[PDB]
Design a protein around this nucleic acid. Structure first.
Ligand code: K
Ligand code: K
Ligand code: K
Ligand code: K
Ligand code: K
Ligand code: K
Ligand code: MG
Ligand code: MG
Ligand code: MG
Ligand code: MG
Ligand code: MG
Ligand code: MG
Ligand code: MG
Ligand code: MG
Ligand code: MG
Ligand code: MG
Ligand code: MG
Ligand code: MG
Ligand code: MG
Ligand code: MG
Ligand code: MG
Ligand code: MG
Ligand code: MG
Ligand code: ZN
Lengths: 175, 122, 207, 37, 9
RNA sequence: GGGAUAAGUGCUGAAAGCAUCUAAGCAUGAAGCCCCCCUCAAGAUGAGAUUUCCCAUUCCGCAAGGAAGUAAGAUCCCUGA
RNA sequence: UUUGGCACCUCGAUGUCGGCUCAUCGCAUCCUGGGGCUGUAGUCGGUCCCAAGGGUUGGGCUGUUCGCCCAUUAAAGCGGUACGCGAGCUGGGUUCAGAACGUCGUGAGACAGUUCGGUCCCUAUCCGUCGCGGGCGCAGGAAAUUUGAGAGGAGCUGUCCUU
RNA sequence: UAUACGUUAAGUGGAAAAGGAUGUGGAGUUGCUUAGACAACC
């Protein structure tokens, strides 16, 4: 894998603890991220440079190699910068609102829909018609963003519903 | 307790004198209809010159029965005969007059025009 | 969960305040006594054992007398367990009374259905008769025993046999009145069993 | 979804993929979604 | 007792 | 109402610098599946558990066994539903 | 599941159509549940995927299966089980002897052409099915209360109001 | 629960065709490529 061969630069305030079964904890300004990797995958940090070494050249390992770099690459970027997906409500009277910890979507149903974000993820509601999921884990940000979009996904006739920021909707014509 | 083939007197001036019950409405295998239930029916005897004619298939609401009806207070009402009133789909009677007493149960089912036209509501 | 044992006295009716006429079953449950507490440590599950209805000494035996010594009570005719109860809320010897229930409370009632003896397929399984005329010699018989191919009758071909005398639960009956002095529950509707039969009244499981 | 024995690219933007041992096509054009079956 | 019998004509 | 799933929808993600619901990993999701609800159920010979009661008799026998009278308890017989 | 082909079991008899009674199974799903695509605005639909839990009407005509029709229904599924089930029922039809019509035959008679009429036997041995007892077992003898391996049951759905 | 070297991931093995497919093993031909290809990104 080209991806697995690529080294990555660790900033000074990104500690890279290891453990049994190549379990790489990653501390930083935002928080702690732990991730157990595949046993055979070889990993090493010299001069603040983490490199993922491929043990064999089987297609099984060609897969795991590139994955292991990508995840560590995301784990670093997570604790340093953090990830955030944006969501845009589109349609008449569609409005989001924070209510303590919970998001509260009013998206055309006969009830308001609530989303409790789990530990680590946080949700910002800048506009009435705009939601932002912020967090350290790129997986877990994408998950909650998708859970929110799932509430009322973009329909094709007028584009109405919760979309991702800069989502291309295939827009069909009604009549 | 009105079922397929039960004949009813018609308690109105629509033209029908006697109807035969074709179908109790309101569910698949429903055997029996009681006061305030709608039935499909054919006109077996008609008054000459009336609006409703012999052989017409029509909807009717049952307004009296021999079986009668039980009320929540544990009282009952029964009549000497089975009778219905031919109706349109909106529950308004096709005739202009109702004959004989009708049961209070017709208020509950929102047959108001019938209840208003009836000489007595027991 | 809460519950009590009584006898079915019979049925009557009661006018509601709105004037509705409510049919009721009268259960007479003199104070039940907690005879034993089964625990997860000792027994492997938590339950209390309620005794009901004092029995004459002649009708008791030494094993019974001994079992009701801890509860310090006369020997009891009917003994049932209640699972799901609050273990800490009960002590051996404690009296459980009809006033655990209140009017409006939804209960499940369990008893043994009246016995009907040997009954045929029409009465016992609600099957159709064959024709009564048109040359029929097929009136109250149970129908084909099944297809040829298996060379046998499948289990659950329903047939004549003893009917009734089974445990039956009726769910979601309402307590209409509790009479603490006469030890009566009045329960809306009808419940399983003969008059004098043991009824168990429990708080409803689907509440 | 078209479930059929012959899954093929219908247009030039169709991609043949494989998920859970099943040959599939995915495309921007949702009419072209195919699963082998 | 049948008119014809089993597997009649 | 739980739990796990089907089709489906995905998230993250490489093999394959991209893309990709999948290969590692993580979700979601049916009147259906397993429960929840009702009944039978330890001949479940794998014969389960708890509480309580009786109490270690007499005679044959080298003992191994055997017989007898009993305990707690039950039944015959009787009044019945 | 059709019509057949073959002629392998049964001619010292494997009762033969339809209905009734009683079901049970398959899924190629009729309804209800979940979906993808749509020449899906909405309401409706079309088409394909998952799904067999439960449900799946009463009449007129005809021996009828089927079918057509009336009126409903959420729906009025398609098939298997000896064209499921006659030692469970029916006996309209088919399938004996009577009689008749058309027709064919010189005739006696003949016709999956028609017509009116026309004996449906059996006290259950075994397994099987549904109930109910007795015996012994379960390292003493008893009286109660129980756990639940395991098994069975249930499982359908409309309309209105509101939003 | 042999030995050796391979293959298969489908319980294929342990029933089926036209046809469909970046499944995977082995051969071989060939376009293009540090005069910098292919992918990504003016
Ligand atoms: K036992
Ligand atoms: K033969
Ligand atoms: K017969
Ligand atoms: K037979
Ligand atoms: K036998
Ligand atoms: K196999
Ligand atoms: Mg009947
Ligand atoms: Mg008779
Ligand atoms: Mg057999
Ligand atoms: Mg094609
Ligand atoms: Mg025992
Ligand atoms: Mg030959
Ligand atoms: Mg023979
Ligand atoms: Mg299917
Ligand atoms: Mg056939
Ligand atoms: Mg048959
Ligand atoms: Mg037979
Ligand atoms: Mg005949
Ligand atoms: Mg001639
Ligand atoms: Mg012939
Ligand atoms: Mg002819
Ligand atoms: Mg069990
Ligand atoms: Mg196989
Ligand atoms: Zn395409």
């Amino acid at each position: 894998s080209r991806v697995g061969k690529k080294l990555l630069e660790i900033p000074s305030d990104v500690t890279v603890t290891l453990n049994d079964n190549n379990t790489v904890a990653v501390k930083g300004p935002k928080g702690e991220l732990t991730r157990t990797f595949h046993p055979d995958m070889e990993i090493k940090v010299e001069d603040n440079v983490l490199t993922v070494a491929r043990p064999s050249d089987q297609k099984e390992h060609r897969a795991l190699h590139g994955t292991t770099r990508s995840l560590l690459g995301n784990m670093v970027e997570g604790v340093s910068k953090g990830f955030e997906r944006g969501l845009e409500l589109v349609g008449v009277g569609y409005r989001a609102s924070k209510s303590g910890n919970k998001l509260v979507l009013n998206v055309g149903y006969s009830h308001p829909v609530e989303i409790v974000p789990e530990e680590g993820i946080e949700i910002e509601v800048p506009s009435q018609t705009k939601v932002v999921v912020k967090g350290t884990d790129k997986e877990r940000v994408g998950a909650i963003a998708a859970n929110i979009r799932a509430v009322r996904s973009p329909e094709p006739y007028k584009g109405k519903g919760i979309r991702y920021e800069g989502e291309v909707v295939r827009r069909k014509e009604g009549k | 307790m009105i079922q397929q083939e039960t004949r009813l007197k018609v308690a109105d001036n629509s033209g029908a004198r006697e109807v035969l019950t074709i179908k109790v409405l309101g569910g698949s295998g429903r055997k029996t209809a009681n006061i305030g239930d709608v039935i499909v029916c054919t006109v077996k005897q008609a008054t000459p010159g009336g609006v409703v004619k012999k052989g017409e298939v029509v909807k009717a609401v049952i307004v009296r029965t021999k079986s009668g009806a039980r009320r929540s207070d544990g009282s009952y009402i029964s009549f000497d005969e089975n009778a219905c009133v031919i109706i349109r789909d909106d529950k308004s009677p096709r005739g202009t007059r109702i004959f004989g007493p009708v049961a209070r149960e017709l208020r509950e089912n929102n047959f108001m025009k019938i209840v208003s036209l009836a000489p007595e509501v027991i | 969960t809460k519950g009590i044992l009584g006898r079915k006295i019979g049925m009557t009716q009661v006018f509601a305040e709105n004037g509705d006429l409510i049919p009721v079953t009268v259960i007479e449950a003199a104070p039940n006594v907690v005879l034993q507490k089964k625990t997860a440590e000792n027994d492997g599950y938590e339950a209390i054992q309620l005794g009901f209805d004092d029995k004459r000494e002649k009708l008791s035996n030494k094993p019974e007398k001994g079992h009701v010594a801890k509860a310090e009570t006369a020997p009891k005719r009917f003994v049932k367990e209640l699972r799901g109860v609050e273990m800490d809320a009960y002590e051996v010897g404690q009296e459980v009374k009809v006033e655990i229930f209140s009017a409006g409370e939804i209960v499940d009632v369990t008893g043994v259905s009246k016995g009907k003896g040997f009954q045929g397929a029409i009465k016992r399984h609600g099957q159709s008769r064959g024709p009564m005329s048109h040359g029929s010699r097929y009136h109250r018989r149970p129908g084909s025993m099944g297809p040829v191919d298996p060379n046998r009758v499948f289990k659950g071909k329903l047939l004549p046999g003893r009917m009734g005398g089974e445990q039956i639960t009726v769910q979601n009956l309402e307590i209409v009145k509790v009479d603490a002095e006469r030890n009566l529950l009045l329960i809306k509707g009808n419940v399983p069993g003969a008059k004098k039969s043991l009824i168990t009244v429990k708080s409803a499981v689907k509440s | 979804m078209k479930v059929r024995p012959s899954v093929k690219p219908i247009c030039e933007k169709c991609k043949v993929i494989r998920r859970k041992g099943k040959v599939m096509v995915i495309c921007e054009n949702p009419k072209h979604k195919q699963k082998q079956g | 007792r049948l008119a014809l019998g089993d597997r009649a004509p």
